[PDB]
Amino acid sequence: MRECISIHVGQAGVQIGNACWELYCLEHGIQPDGQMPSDKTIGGGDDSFNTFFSETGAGKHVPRAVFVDLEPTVIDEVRTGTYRQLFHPEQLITGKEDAANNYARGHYTIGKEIIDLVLDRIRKLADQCTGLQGFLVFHSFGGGTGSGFTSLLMERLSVDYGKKSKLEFSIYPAPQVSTAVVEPYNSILTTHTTLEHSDCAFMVDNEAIYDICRRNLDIERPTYTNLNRLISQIVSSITASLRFDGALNVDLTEFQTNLVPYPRIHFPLATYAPVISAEKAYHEQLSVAEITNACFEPANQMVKCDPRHGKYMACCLLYRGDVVPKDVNAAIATIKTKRSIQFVDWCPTGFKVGINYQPPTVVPGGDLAKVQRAVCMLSNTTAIAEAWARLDHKFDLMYAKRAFVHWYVGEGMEEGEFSEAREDMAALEKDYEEVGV
Amino acid sequence: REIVHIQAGQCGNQIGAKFWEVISDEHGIDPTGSYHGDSDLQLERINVYYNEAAGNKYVPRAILVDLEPGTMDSVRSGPFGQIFRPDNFVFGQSGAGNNWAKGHYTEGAELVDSVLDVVRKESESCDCLQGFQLTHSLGGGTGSGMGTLLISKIREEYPDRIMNTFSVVPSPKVSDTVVEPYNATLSVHQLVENTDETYCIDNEALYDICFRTLKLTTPTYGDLNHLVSATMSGVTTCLRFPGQLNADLRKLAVNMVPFPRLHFFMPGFAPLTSRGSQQYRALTVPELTQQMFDAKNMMAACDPRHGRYLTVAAVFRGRMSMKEVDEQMLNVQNKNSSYFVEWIPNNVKTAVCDIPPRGLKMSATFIGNSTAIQELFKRISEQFTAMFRRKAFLHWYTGEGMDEMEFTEAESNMNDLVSEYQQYQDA
Amino acid sequence: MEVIELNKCTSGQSFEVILKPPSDPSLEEIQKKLEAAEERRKYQEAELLKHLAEKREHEREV
Amino acid sequence: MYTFVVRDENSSVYAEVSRLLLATGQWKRLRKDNPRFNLMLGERNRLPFGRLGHEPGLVQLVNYYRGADKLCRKASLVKLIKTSPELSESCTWFPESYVIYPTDEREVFLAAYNRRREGREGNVWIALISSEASELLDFIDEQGQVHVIQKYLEKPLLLEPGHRKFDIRSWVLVDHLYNIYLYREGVLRTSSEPYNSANFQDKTCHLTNHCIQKNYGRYEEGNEMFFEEFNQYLMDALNTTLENSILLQIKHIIRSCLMCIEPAISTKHLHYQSFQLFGFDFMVDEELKVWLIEVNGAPACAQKLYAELCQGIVDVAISSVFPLATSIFIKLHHHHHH
Numbered sequence A: 001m002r003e004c005i006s007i008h009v010g011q012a013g014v015q016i017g018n019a020c021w022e023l024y025c026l027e028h029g030i031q032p033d034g035q036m037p038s039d040k041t042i043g044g045g046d047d048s049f050n051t052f053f054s055e056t057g058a059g060k061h062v063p064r065a066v067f068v069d070l071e072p073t074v075i076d077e078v079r080t081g082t083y084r085q086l087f088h089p090e091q092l093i094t095g096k097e098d099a100a101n102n103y104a105r106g107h108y109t110i111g112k113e114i115i116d117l118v119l120d121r122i123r124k125l126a127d128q129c130t131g132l133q134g135f136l137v138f139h140s141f142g143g144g145t146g147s148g149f150t151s152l153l154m155e156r157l158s159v160d161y162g163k164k165s166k167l168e169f170s171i172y173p174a175p176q177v178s179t180a181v182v183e184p185y186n187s188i189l190t191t192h193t194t195l196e197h198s199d200c201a202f203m204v205d206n207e208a209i210y211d212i213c214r215r216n217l218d219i220e221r222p223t224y225t226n227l228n229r230l231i232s233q234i235v236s237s238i239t240a241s242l243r244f245d246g247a248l249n250v251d252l253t254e255f256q257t258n259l260v261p262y263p264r265i266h267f268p269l270a271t272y273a274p275v276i277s278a279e280k281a282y283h284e285q286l287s288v289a290e291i292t293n294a295c296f297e298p299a300n301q302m303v304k305c306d307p308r309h310g311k312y313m314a315c316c317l318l319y320r321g322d323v324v325p326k327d328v329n330a331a332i333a334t335i336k337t338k339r340s341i342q343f344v345d346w347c348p349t350g351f352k353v354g355i356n357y358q359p360p361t362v363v364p365g366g367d368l369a370k371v372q373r374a375v376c377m378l379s380n381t382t383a384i385a386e387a388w389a390r391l392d393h394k395f396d397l398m399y400a401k402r403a404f405v406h407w408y409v410g411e412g413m414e415e416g417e418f419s420e421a422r423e424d425m426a427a428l429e430k431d432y433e434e435v436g437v
Numbered sequence B: 001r002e003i004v005h006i007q008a009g010q011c012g013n014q015i016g017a018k019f020w021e022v023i024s025d026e027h028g029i030d031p032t033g034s035y036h037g038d039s040d041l042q043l044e045r046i047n048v049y050y051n052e053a054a055g056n057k058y059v060p061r062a063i064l065v066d067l068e069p070g071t072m073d074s075v076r077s078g079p080f081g082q083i084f085r086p087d088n089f090v091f092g093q094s095g096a097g098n099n100w101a102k103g104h105y106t107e108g109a110e111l112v113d114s115v116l117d118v119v120r121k122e123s124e125s126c127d128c129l130q131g132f133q134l135t136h137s138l139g140g141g142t143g144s145g146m147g148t149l150l151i152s153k154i155r156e157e158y159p160d161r162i163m164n165t166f167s168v169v170p171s172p173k174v175s176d177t178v179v180e181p182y183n184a185t186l187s188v189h190q191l192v193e194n195t196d197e198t199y200c201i202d203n204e205a206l207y208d209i210c211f212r213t214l215k216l217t218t219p220t221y222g223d224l225n226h227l228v229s230a231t232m233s234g235v236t237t238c239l240r241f242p243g244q245l246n247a248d249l250r251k252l253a254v255n256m257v258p259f260p261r262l263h264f265f266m267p268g269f270a271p272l273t274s275r276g277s278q279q280y281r282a283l284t285v286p287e288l289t290q291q292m293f294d295a296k297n298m299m300a301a302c303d304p305r306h307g308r309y310l311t312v313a314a315v316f317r318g319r320m321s322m323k324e325v326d327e328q329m330l331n332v333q334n335k336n337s338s339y340f341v342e343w344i345p346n347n348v349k350t351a352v353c354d355i356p357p358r359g360l361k362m363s364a365t366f367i368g369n370s371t372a373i374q375e376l377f378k379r380i381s382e383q384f385t386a387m388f389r390r391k392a393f394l395h396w397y398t399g400e401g402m403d404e405m406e407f408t409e410a411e412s413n414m415n416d417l418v419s420e421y422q423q424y425q426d427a
Numbered sequence C: 001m002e003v004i005e006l007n008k009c010t011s012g013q014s015f016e017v018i019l020k021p022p023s024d025p026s027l028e029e030i031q032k033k034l035e036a037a038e039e040r041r042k043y044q045e046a047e048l049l050k051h052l053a054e055k056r057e058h059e060r061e062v
Numbered sequence D: 001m002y003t004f005v006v007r008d009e010n011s012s013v014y015a016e017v018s019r020l021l022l023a024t025g026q027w028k029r030l031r032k033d034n035p036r037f038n039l040m041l042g043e044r045n046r047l048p049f050g051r052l053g054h055e056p057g058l059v060q061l062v063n064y065y066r067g068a069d070k071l072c073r074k075a076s077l078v079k080l081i082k083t084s085p086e087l088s089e090s091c092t093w094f095p096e097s098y099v100i101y102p103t104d105e106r107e108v109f110l111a112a113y114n115r116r117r118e119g120r121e122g123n124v125w126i127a128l129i130s131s132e133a134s135e136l137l138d139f140i141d142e143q144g145q146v147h148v149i150q151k152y153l154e155k156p157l158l159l160e161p162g163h164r165k166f167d168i169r170s171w172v173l174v175d176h177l178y179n180i181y182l183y184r185e186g187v188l189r190t191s192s193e194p195y196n197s198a199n200f201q202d203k204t205c206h207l208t209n210h211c212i213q214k215n216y217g218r219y220e221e222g223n224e225m226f227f228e229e230f231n232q233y234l235m236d237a238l239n240t241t242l243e244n245s246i247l248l249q250i251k252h253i254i255r256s257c258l259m260c261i262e263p264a265i266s267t268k269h270l271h272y273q274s275f276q277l278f279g280f281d282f283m284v285d286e287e288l289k290v291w292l293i294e295v296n297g298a299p300a301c302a303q304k305l306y307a308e309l310c311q312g313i314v315d316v317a318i319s320s321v322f323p324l325a326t327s328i329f330i331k332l333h334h335h336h337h338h
């Protein structure tokens, strides 16, 4: 058994972490007070769920989680929420005043004053770890904390923990739920500085989650709460292999082996089905074939793009519920005939399949209907680079005029970092196109 | 995240008192400083603007400044006079004679350190101060000259704090003296350097609005200030009430100001209403959106179609469909996208607050960062030059120690600002 | 077609299906980047506080 | 008020569509980089498909199908036929062709040619038209990039008076629902010099290109014969009609090609939508069999028809998606049960 530490940075990371840790508790039968009746390993153990929870002599199961924001108000809602007893104050780290959507402010100015304290509270959890695999880092591209401080944390973790794997869940900015305008700057700056410190990064475009909530959950104008519960379902699907018995994606290392042949191109695309409104009266339950085929519909993807116009380097299918291998392989064979699924010539054309029999857990009072079977597909397709192209073009439009740059220079950052990061992205965009056409 | 509020001079104190009168009502604070509201939503951010005192009484974090006592005596005997902390009335006796020099260099200089003592005392009682705001005019001498001296000295003592202003720009249609272009030009230079957001209230737009739309044949300054306080309440709504997302002044400024000197905004309000005259028909979201984007509803006398929007913020208040808001906001941009700069993507942002203002079921506040504001500064420059080429009325200033060079300098800087706006209008 | 590495437990199972075969900077440099930006800040703050000092001199002179 | 942008200025067809759209009073043109468009008339190179369909509150439509180049490139078209089972190396209406890379299936073309020379059968090929394999294998290496080799049709149907050659051009509109519309008016880009079966090196009677023919204008105005006459000439000379002898095959070829790549390019469930205008080029042999030569993805129209086709595009491809405040197209559909 090897432990995983989760780091939630900024507003988006913190509120997504709460969504995830709440779902984890329901999945493992852990109550809000940290008691887990079914665990008979009182005060310890090396069960799979211990990867994400530690135990106290009093039988309290505590997340291996650090929440960090440069501003108290979001994390205060953790300290007073339904799961207040779950975490202890040493895990919740807040500043006074935030990065104001300014990458330079979160990385250089404000980050410098808090980085040491955070690394200390992380090193207090890693001390309780018999063997640490690495970290799961949740954050937004857009925020000043999520972009700036995250990349500073990641640089240092590669120093303090050189052997130790690092995975991100990153919220890609969307205008529909953002009141910011400088997010393209922060996104490119954090990607350039984090890229060679991250082994695998799962991007979630808020635009895609937003439209999924509208189309399939019949929610007129989604809130962060609607978005985060859906995101946590997908994050849980990705991390379930780390928390339950199985043989696929059992350690953070296997994630990059199975999904990331090329280190730089480490942005797998997640597609999830089915999303069904809990308020939908009559629902015909969907088969293995139907949900699997839905993994190739762009409208079910975490990032709107067209995989038909790129090439796959890897593909995992992760099932929850009543699924058996015979039906999976029959569905794949049908889908292969009907759909354009073209791999790079040096990778085998195939799918790694993991089935967990427990059907997905849903938050009581949420927007998601319970389903008999669900699937999350992790595919490393070059088509996700469309998201880099959109973001880079927005960056180019503003930077040509140096709009908003004075804010970043005024916190100690040099205009040349803008052009360094942008060309790194230009190199990344060509890496994707070498491989994909 | 507390804000410290300062109001300076005749105009600054009259509009400023209306602000505290309006929001004190919105937060259920009576003229005694005692809370008598119904909801808890109207006390969650009350720390932003009010200090809590003994007796569960709320005291505005407001400093009242003048160089003559007449207007501040009228404030204390005024509708909400008792609520202000009496130690925060800081005033001289000699007046400023509608003279920027007196307010900035001689009479104001004598008084400024006393004002800054109160500012410091109010600041040190702030858990996390997030900035300052000032109300003042640019046409007189105290608010214009001493107000900008205060701003310079506040930035010296608090160089990293946000500073925002409501600045009443002078106009000959509503005018007290002929030297207003002189005082405005000198003040604008200071604002260009030392403020993060300046909401430009042009006193003739308020006049045309009161006359042509509210059908008031002889509007008073009081009618003019009703429109201003409606906007002041509107633009601060999302700091004073829990809502969609909370941004501190810095984050708000970051996303509205792409260039440090171009921070002079065009405010607007819909529906436009007069005191007393009761509105019975609520507006539909399409009606609010058309009106708040219409030139007639702007309070800086500038045609938005003569320039391009760098950024726009809109604050809707009341119960309404945020979906309908999204669609109507997206309809305005997609229908007139040639008045928005194509090189700042998604530069129109929106917020909604469920709490409507007093007397309206529904309202919208418009904040426009348009290059059309250059027309306001061109007007001042023309009026400035018309007198300055003959050195007219300068003796009022040279007698306080000023040289012609400082005027030449002030004139040149504002002509730079105008040309800076023109660069981005053609990009 | 070909189903391999099948592995079963009480919780679920996993396998692989192939349809076809194929054809860090140091804590030193970090500290320096950050401090080279903190000095960049105080140079800018000093120029402002200087520019404000020249203004103060002009106020005394008027 | 719908909005659109223009990003291909060399486009004769969409230059006219732009004119039609503005002259309705309900469409307005923005500038090339204004991303708030309902409709895009895009460039032919590196059109940024990845940036479409991400503008909140704007239904977005582009006049090109991402992925359609696999049909409109000679190297890729050859590939698509002998690689897609629905077209299948045995395809009956596409000339025998191979992909040869300059120093690939050159070996395969040596063998399939040898019992076409040492098999006592007719023998000519095209890329240069020759009858010896080395005359061609020396020319493709000498010119640069990959070329397509293709069997040359030594028995083309010839138009009398003149004993001439021709090729048929048909314009096809695929809308966002992937309806396949054949414009009823085609054209024959005819030769005016009689076909010379012996000397292939003079390529004025072998190559029917409207430009490379500029005996211009003798028989028809512009080396362009329209469908009413070609129908009449077929009736008088061969007793048949255009519909029966040729067009049925044309519709079959058009439909087979576009249905083959439909899964790869369809925008049914996509966040943006595509239509596209294609020009198919056919070639009739003496036995009245239709052969597909090439598919042009950015076709120019003929002068008499611009008014009609460019209106048709607006009616069924644009206004279907952006409605405003008998038909000139033949809809190609067929579901035979088996």
Ligand SMILES: Nc1nc2c(ncn2[C@@H]2O[C@H](COP(=O)(O)OP(=O)(O)OP(=O)(O)O)[C@@H](O)[C@H]2O)c(=O)[nH]1
Binding pocket: A009, A010, A011, A012, A013, A015, A016, A069, A070, A071, A098, A099, A100, A101, A102, A106, A140, A141, A142, A143, A144, A145, A146, A147, A171, A172, A173, A174, A177, A178, A179, A180, A183, A206, A224, A225, A227, A228, A231
């Ligand atoms: N999905 C999701 N996205 C969020 C959430 N909260 C914020 N965001 C996104 O984050 C972006 C802005 O960055 P934030 O995370 O809010 O800012 P931050 O990380 O707290 O850093 P600061 O700027 O210092 O406050 C916007 O584009 C939002 O869409 C959330 O709860 N769920």
Ligand SMILES: Nc1ncnc2c1ncn2[C@@H]1O[C@H](COP(=O)(O)OP(=O)(O)CP(=O)(O)O)[C@@H](O)[C@H]1O
Binding pocket: D095, D126, D150, D151, D152, D153, D154, D166, D167, D206, D207, D208, D209, D281, D283, D293, D294, D296
């Ligand atoms: N296998 C074959 N047999 C006989 N003739 C052939 C042939 N392949 C091509 N041709 C002739 O070559 C001529 C032009 O060929 P092709 O269509 O490749 O040129 P092109 O691509 O410039 C036409 P467009 O201008 O419409 O794009 C046609 O008139 C056709 O008759």
Ligand SMILES: c1cc(CNc2cc3c(cn2)[nH]c2ccccc23)cc(Oc2ccc3c(c2)OCO3)c1
Binding pocket: A179, B016, B019, B133, B134, B135, B164, B165, B166, B197, B199, B232, B233, B235, B236, B238, B239, B249, B252, B253, B255, B256, B313, B314, B315, B349, B350, B351, B367
């Ligand atoms: C504090 C806050 C503001 C509002 N500033 C703001 C808002 C938004 C924004 C950028 N900036 N972007 C947005 C997107 C969506 C919604 C809102 C915003 C203005 C202000 O100025 C004064 C100055 C003197 C006064 C005064 C107010 O009241 C009495 O005296 C003070």
Ligand SMILES: Nc1nc2c(ncn2[C@@H]2O[C@H](COP(=O)(O)OP(=O)(O)O)[C@@H](O)[C@H]2O)c(=O)[nH]1
Binding pocket: B008, B009, B010, B011, B012, B014, B015, B096, B097, B098, B099, B137, B138, B139, B140, B141, B142, B143, B144, B168, B169, B170, B171, B174, B175, B176, B177, B180, B203, B221, B222, B224, B225
């Ligand atoms: N809106 C408004 N403007 C005013 C008022 N009083 C004066 N002004 C304007 O301010 C200018 C005079 O400045 P003044 O208020 O005397 O500055 P002071 O010396 O600081 O008090 C004139 O151009 C007027 O248009 C008022 O009550 N309301």
Ligand SMILES: [Ca+2]
Binding pocket: A039, A041, A044, A045, A046, A047, A050
């Ligand atoms: Ca255990």
Ligand SMILES: [Mg+2]
Binding pocket: A010, A011, A071, A098, A143, A145
């Ligand atoms: Mg935050």
Ligand SMILES: [Mg+2]
Binding pocket: B010, B098, B140, B176
């Ligand atoms: Mg006066």
